[PDB]
UniProtKB/Swiss-Prot annotation, chain A:
The chain holds residues 510 to 767 of 1024 of the full protein. This is NLR family CARD domain-containing protein 4. Isoform 2 is expressed ubiquitously, although highly expressed in lung and spleen. Isoform 1 is highly expressed in lung, followed by leukocytes especially monocytes, lymph node, colon, brain, prostate, placenta, spleen, bone marrow and fetal liver. Isoform 4 is only detected in brain. It is linked to Autoinflammation with infantile enterocolitis: An autosomal dominant disorder characterized by neonatal-onset enterocolitis, periodic fever, and fatal or near-fatal episodes of autoinflammation. Affected individuals tend to have poor overall growth and gastrointestinal symptoms in infancy, recurrent febrile episodes with splenomegaly, and sometimes hematologic disturbances, arthralgias, or myalgias. Familial cold autoinflammatory syndrome 4: A form of autoinflammatory syndrome, a rare autosomal dominant systemic disease characterized by recurrent episodes of maculopapular rash associated with arthralgias, myalgias, fever and chills, swelling of the extremities, and conjunctivitis after generalized exposure to cold. Phosphorylated at Ser-24 following infection of macrophages with S.typhimurium (Salmonella). Phosphorylation is essential for NLRC4 inflammasome function to promote caspase-1 activation and pyroptosis. PRKCD phosphorylates Ser-24 in vitro. In an autoinhibited form the C-terminal leucine-rich repeat (LRR) domain is positioned to sterically occlude one side of the NBD domain and consequently sequester NLRC4 in a monomeric state. An ADP-mediated interaction between the NBD and the WHD also contributes to the autoinhibition.
């Protein structure tokens, strides 16, 4: 816990098979492999801390030491792979899992909902990423709602989703914690665009590969509603 | 004396009202599931509430009470000090009910023993909830309070939120709200009030049909679990799914409809 210095940044590509996010976020632009590797290294560091906890047979006895260790770190969770130990970590080690600054949930199994939709606490900041979504099922939206709401601050990144167009306002309207919204090469309707321009508590807005041009009252017309926008 | 679902000839009520005059030792009276009577019930309030007695609990439920009967009681609230339980609820006042309520609400300034006040329903008594606040804040022993059988809008919970600020009772246990018209934006507006009501024994906050956001489900389970008692609260009319019922903590009893 007393080690904050990173140290050697060579190799360490063993953890997190999606080293390049399997063609998702952190793509061609704004790479910086050094920072990508640091993220991998810290993520494996957090996992190691969790593994040491699990084998310490000290579910509550050593909560003070683990609190100091985990505080200020980020944890990455793949929705397609949620190990049993995460459930015990979040359920049995309160005030430590919540001491993490960020949890990254990268996509919708009901298990993902079960882990996040608990009654132990609200998470600080959640970063939700949507990737291979050619269709948005009504059930999927319901499940996302349950996850999105379990936080104080929400960051949402939607990349190359085809099933989202016409349903973006439908999803965004389920949670008011959204303050950072990014859309990458993903189509939308005017109703979805108007909705984005109707959310006044956004701090970050990022639009990529939008080829519509003629967008009445949209993000290309005014966008002066987002007075709190910084980026 | 308990009279439970007993059929009357619409005349006997008058004769009993007179007979009751000599029962100077009577303390408890229950009148339940009354059939349609109309005239005859006003004779009870005319005969009683006077010629002073030791009545401790007067519980007339669903007794076809008129606004005039309520006005008669209001005039007679100078009597029957020591009375603690006053019901006369589960009853709709067809006309001028609000006026009758206004007169008694501005009284009860001699009734220092009042607990568990239940109110009569009128269309729309809701416009006078602030009139209740006017004197409810003056009674430090309101362990129970019931506001049943009427629509209660988001505006009204904000009014009650002011009531529930509050200069604390530290003895409030029972809250009864049989129905409402509260939106998905809250409700939530008065959550946290429970921090001042840690000894709540039970409540309902029921409705006709409502489907809460996941956020509201989470707030319920993370708040009620901090209560000292929570002795079989109900959530009638709330569309909780199996997933939401899983989230709701191990309450002694749980009713959804």
């Amino acid at each position: 816990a007393a080690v904050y210095q990173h140290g050697c940044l060579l190799g360490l590509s063993i953890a997190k098979r999606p080293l390049w996010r399997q063609e998702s976020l952190q793509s061609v632009k704004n790479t910086t492999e050094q920072e990508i590797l640091k993220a991998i290294n810290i993520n494996s560091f957090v996992e190691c801390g969790i593994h040491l906890y699990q084998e310490s047979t000290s579910k509550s006895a050593l909560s003070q030491e683990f609190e100091a260790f985990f505080q200020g770190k980020s944890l990455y969770i793949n929705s397609g792979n949620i190990p049993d130990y995460l459930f015990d970590f979040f359920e049995h080690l309160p005030n430590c899992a919540s001491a993490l600054d960020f949890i990254k949930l990268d996509f919708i199994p009901s298990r993902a909902v079960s882990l996040f939709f608990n009654w132990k606490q609200e998470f600080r900041t959640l970063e939700v990423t949507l990737r291979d979504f050619s269709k948005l099922n009504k059930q999927d939206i319901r499940y996302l709602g349950k996850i999105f709401s379990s936080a104080t601050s929400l960051r949402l990144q939607i990349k190359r989703c085809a099933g989202v167009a016409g349903s973006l306002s439908l999803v965004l309207s389920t949670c008011k914690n959204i303050y950072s919204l990014m859309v990458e090469a993903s189509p939308l309707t005017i109703e979805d665009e108007r909705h984005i321009t109707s959310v006044t508590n956004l701090k970050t807005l990022s639009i990529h590969d939008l080829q519509n041009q003629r967008l009445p009252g949209g993000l290309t017309d005014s966008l002066g509603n987002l007075k709190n926008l910084t980026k | 004396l308990i009279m439970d679902n007993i059929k009357m000839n619409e005349e006997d009520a008058i004769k009993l009202a007179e007979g009751l005059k000599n029962l100077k030792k009577m303390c408890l009276f229950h009148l339940t599931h009354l059939s349609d009577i109309g005239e005859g019930m006003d004779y009870i309030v005319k005969s009683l509430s006077s010629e002073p007695c030791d009545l401790e609990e007067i519980q007339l439920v669903s007794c076809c009470l008129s606004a005039n009967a309520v006005k008669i009681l209001a005039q007679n609230l100078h009597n029957l000090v020591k009375l603690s339980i006053l019901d006369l609820s589960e009853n709709y006042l067809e006309k001028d009910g609000n006026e009758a309520l206004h007169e008694l609400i501005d009284r009860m300034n001699v009734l220092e023993q009042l607990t568990a006040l239940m109110l009569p329903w009128g269309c729309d008594v809701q416009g006078s909830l602030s009139s209740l606040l006017k004197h409810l804040e003056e009674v430090p022993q309101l362990v129970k309070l019931g506001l049943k059988n009427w629509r209660l809008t988001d505006t009204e919970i904000r009014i009650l939120g002011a009531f529930f600020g509050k200069n604390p009772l530290k003895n409030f246990q029972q809250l009864n709200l049989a129905g409402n018209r509260v939106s998905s934006d809250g409700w939530l507006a008065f959550m946290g009030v429970f921090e001042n009501l840690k000894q709540l024994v039970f409540f309902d906050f029921s409705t006709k049909e409502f489907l809460p956001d996941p956020a509201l489900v989470r707030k319920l389970s993370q708040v009620l679990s901090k209560l000292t008692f929570l002795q079989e609260a109900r959530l009638v009319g709330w569309q909780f799914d199996d997933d939401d019922l899983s989230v709701i903590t191990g309450a002694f009893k749980l009713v959804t409809a």
